[PDB]
Write a protein that binds this ligand. Structure first.
Ligand SMILES: [Fe+3]
Ligand SMILES: [Fe+3]
Ligand SMILES: [Fe+3]
Ligand SMILES: [Fe+3]
Lengths: 233, 200, 233, 200, 233, 200, 200
């Protein structure tokens, strides 16, 4: 069984987006009004699932083959998972989901007029290697209109979920693409108050990782809460 | 002062989270192995129970697109971190609310006692994380059992809650579903009876 | 008895901290939701107690002798009380309270693991002189942990209460010490939106007032609402 | 325009205010002379009354660490600013709520009428300033009496409050305590029945 | 026995304080007048003691327990010892001494009027780990007056001694605390001519290493002379 | 050019150095194991000797708060780096000057000969480091023996000192103390007879 | 930190200081009232004495252009601050060294004892300030008497000087000039037997 041997650096709740961010409409009614109650870390919080034994299919991480060929911009999305101290996070679960090339999601509740791609599902998962590396192969998602303000459009993005070493480190975020002019206008992005935090969400074009005459690549590194050993407790 | 690298900022899971983390629910084909709502196989030691609840917004309306993740100890008060579909019991699971009824369910066992860092025992509890469209950063909570009054009265965590009335929001109500032991844990994100949410 | 001859400059409610400052958790449930009702000044508001005749003890203002010697850095805290027009406020009551060298308070509700000091109480009072000057002798208080976020620490501080010429001038605030790195991280300090207002609460090292081979000194001047004569009323 | 020196910014009194301003209450030894909750000696002229009340937060929970300061006129409608423990009456006082029961008390006389700057009489009132942890800048209010209905109706101050329903929040309810004339004045800082607070 | 296999980068005597620094009065008579004589490195200079087998007590490094609890600000003092090449210095001896919370030293010759603390000694020792890490648990020392100029005050400081791999690397220094306003006024600190050099002696508040509701933490990294292999000798 | 990280700058040991590095001397309780002035146990091979001396400032006044560190080879000319109180010989030691008399003493053996980097023999010597208040960066010196005149004349280190007269400052004078072979080695930090100090 | 206005910086008095402060000396006509070297009138109470001395530079050469100021208590150990030529005794005086001989002289009475701030008596002493070309800021010193050994040994000021040998530089040697009780106090600015100079 798991043991209480670590402590995690406290979250900066001013760096992350706050709960109540009115421009993002839905947040109004889905945000607590009472303050969060801070509690000391225990075995309950410092442990979490290890996914090393989950049985991954051979194309779990390959959106081009896991659902012919989908239509759209062939890309590889890769990067490293590290902690705040700069330490790699080996064998951790990285899960992603996104829309197709025209901004349509393969979900019943998606009524956007752009059509589905018969060769694309939009789901991937990869366990990080010994060095904290993960990689996915897919098509670049298109932007999509959503009912917030009368003319709001999400910048092209990929949803990410990462486990890390404990429930304490678990995170859900979104990746955006370098240079998309829609970024600065999104109320979701804008839930984040520090522009410097915003930049951490932008994947960079990586010509070094591209496959000539085949596909481009983007680099997206993720940083989880620093892990230290207890001391004088 | 010393500053480390900043942690990647959170973003909402969005309304289509199910496509990535709840395949069946998104109504899409599943893979060989999925992480779902059955923590215990029928032959797992401990008291088998059904957990169910609804999630409410600040207007008292049902949150139909929520996604929950749970973490708990087995019946012997042990955290089983090596996730495997072959195990008779897994400490980790996932669930979601019905786009229809808006109710989530989980099949598990009543967790055994675990001590805090100071060696004080904590009442049997289940750790919950809630995600959904409109939630910028996931909300942490705990589910406690009304049939453990004794232990609850002494929990070092429940006791950190200033107002006794607030503590009661974390206590699941023992009930029966098809003559099977169950506990109902509703979450009120905002307003009257608002559920206690933790930072750690 | 008291006479209605004065008017006090209106307070700047954007200078002072607002009632609702979310990062300071307790402020959520303890801040009004309705706007304050402005009322013209009357005798009720422009008068207040004069404490010239309170029987102060000989060591009222000396925390070193008023409770062996306490353990900690011996310091004199002195300054002047003036109004916004720069006029001194003579014979006015100055009350102060603080923790010991370890950040522990002599109050039942204080459960911090730092020990009490057998020779330290932590309470002082002083009536300003003809020139608006006050002085205290004590030990520099230690910072202390508090249940706000999971790792919050108040910077070392001394609590102050000043009466002034009327109930309109009465004020409660906190003194912070020059250079303390905990200052810019405190949610309570931050309840103050203008950094320039924050500067006003920082006591400066005062080598000129120190007693060589004995104790250091800090200077902290206080500004109460400007007092003027009524005109054309 | 002309800008004077800025006023020293306020800070919350904190949970330990009692140590500096309500010694007994903090359960600490007191000095020879303390500013407390007895404005009038049994022999002060006027109608001797007892005031009591509780303070509530926005959740409807008692605020047990409150500190209050009062200022009122004597029975002739005169403000007595020369504070002396020898006086039969002092216009200034202090009180605080029980860490237990959460109620404050004050022993005084009913104040006489005072005129506003324009020469119009105000109904009998007691000026109150409220301090506590979570309160960044103190709250000012007034306590009027339910048995001064005729006078209350004409108060220029009370009349400044737009909504008559709000006016009611400022009226103390007369009762008896150990067969003595008392008035109960609860303060609701936030929400339902929120007490009016002033700026001046 | 030890062997001559290393060379140490030559010291920068313009970086370190000079011998004669007249504002520090005692240096006048205790500084040489002749030039130092330079000599090549031999086995004599390139070797030194290894303390791996000294029998250290269980609380040698915990000044809260090694002497009731001491009065004062509880802190952890930690860091890493590395050479100029950035290589960690494993299993090296680190010793420290300091005054109590009031500036009082537990030594015969200290007659400062601040009282001794019955539960505090002021000495610690720690052997660096495989990674070059050390840590101590103590209380923040108080500044104190000394007979130099008529009103001289040392900033709060901790004395340190570091062995390193040879007698050529052995160093004695002092740690100062971030933001202390006494720093710039100290004739001792000022024995160092380069402001950049002074910065190296300042320990930074380290919130990430603190124990919530328990104690704060300071980070102090030490750099010893770069060690290299001999070549073409 | 290439610049590496700068070395941490030195600071004076100060007047209370004893509390940290000479416990007994500070007259404080000592720990189980201390690094002190006895490099050789009675049963260590080689010639047993006593070392003693005084330290003078530029005014010819005794420095009574000095702290010294010594490094030397065993009688076989070997440097014993693994420090252990169980050893019959340790190459490393510590000593300090009396707050009273101001004299230090060390109990060791006469070191054997060691070659320099070029393979040339050095005369028998003890490496000394001096620390104290008023000394910003420690002083390095060597102790040679007057009864080794032959070896001394050929030392490649001693020979680096330009002026013969300065060389003399490095030679300890053989004596006897309670019929024990002893050598006196006085250090003059500044002025007439100023001891040679090295840089390496 | 708080910074006050800066004191005006000192500058050397230069070689012609006599023209402004030692008129006679400059060999210029004097004014009606001058501040000179006769602190006591024949009839002033206490023991009448004569002070004399020379001033030496770092090369051991006489300083023939020095100017000195003195401050001392009276025979009853009292400071007489109201300077008046009518007074029997004045606590302040001025003298200078001969461009010829290089000697200064003062006519006074042996000062009484005064207590330091802590209430401890100091040995009888004369406070002196020295000015001259080549001296950027004046040097402060004290003159003590060789016939007051007992007091001298207890002086809290004399006791602040680290090395006892240095203390001696402050003691005047009793003698007799023309059968009158005299004391000789020579000042050595630099080098061998350099006089102690204070900062306050
Ligand atoms: Fe999306
Ligand atoms: Fe406080
Ligand atoms: Fe020191
Ligand atoms: Fe001139």
């Amino acid at each position: 069984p798991a043991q209480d041997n670590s402590r995690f650096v406290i979250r900066d709740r001013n760096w992350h987006p706050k709960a109540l961010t009115p421009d993002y409409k839905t947040s109004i009614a889905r945000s607590p009004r009472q303050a969060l109650v801070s509690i000391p870390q225990s075995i309950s919080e410092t442990t979490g699932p290890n996914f090393s034994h989950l049985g991954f299919g051979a194309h779990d991480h390959d959106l081009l083959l896991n659902f012919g060929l989908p239509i759209g911009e062939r890309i590889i999305v890769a990067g490293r998972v590290v902690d705040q101290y700069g330490k790699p996070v080996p064998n951790t679960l990285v899960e992603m989901w996104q829309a197709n090339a025209g901004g349509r999601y393969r979900h019943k509740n998606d009524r956007y007029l752009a059509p589905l791609d018969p060769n694309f599902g939009g789901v991937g998962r990869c366990l990080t290697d010994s060095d904290g590396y993960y990689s996915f192969r897919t098509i670049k998602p298109g932007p999509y209109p959503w009912r917030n303000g009368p003319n709001d459009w999400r910048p092209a993005h990929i949803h990410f979920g990462i486990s890390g070493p404990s429930i304490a480190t678990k995170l859900i975020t979104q990746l955006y693409f370098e240079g998309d002019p829609l970024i600065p206008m999104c109320p979701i992005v804008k839930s984040i108050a520090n522009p410097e935090a915003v930049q951490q969400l932008i994947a960079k074009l990586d010509m070094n990782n591209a496959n000539p005459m085949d596909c481009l690549a983007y680099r997206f590194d993720i940083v989880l809460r620093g892990q230290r050993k207890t001391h004088f407790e | 002062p010393i500053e480390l690298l900043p942690e990647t900022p959170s973003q909402t899971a969005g309304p289509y989270v199910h496509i990535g983390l709840a395949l069946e629910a998104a109504g899409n084909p599943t893979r060989d192995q999925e992480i779902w709502n059955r923590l215990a196989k029928p032959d797992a030691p401990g008291e088998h129970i059904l957990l169910l609840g609804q999630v409410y917004d600040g207007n008292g309306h049902l949150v139909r697109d929520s996604f929950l993740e749970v973490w708990q100890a087995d019946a012997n008060g042990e955290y089983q971190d090596a996730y495997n579909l072959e195990n008779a019991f897994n400490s980790f699971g996932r669930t979601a609310t019905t786009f229809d009824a808006g109710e989530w369910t989980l099949h598990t066992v009543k967790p055994g006692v675990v001590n805090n860092a100071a060696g004080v025992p904590m009442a049997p509890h289940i750790n919950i994380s809630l995600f959904a469209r409109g939630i910028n950063i996931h909300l942490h909570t705990r589910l406690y059992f009304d049939d453990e009054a004794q232990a609850n009265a002494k929990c070092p965590v429940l006791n950190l809650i200033e107002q006794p009335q607030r503590r009661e929001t974390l206590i699941a109500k023992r009930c029966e579903v098809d003559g099977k032991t169950a506990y109902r844990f509703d979450i009120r994100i905002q307003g009257e009876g608002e559920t206690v949410f933790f930072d750690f």
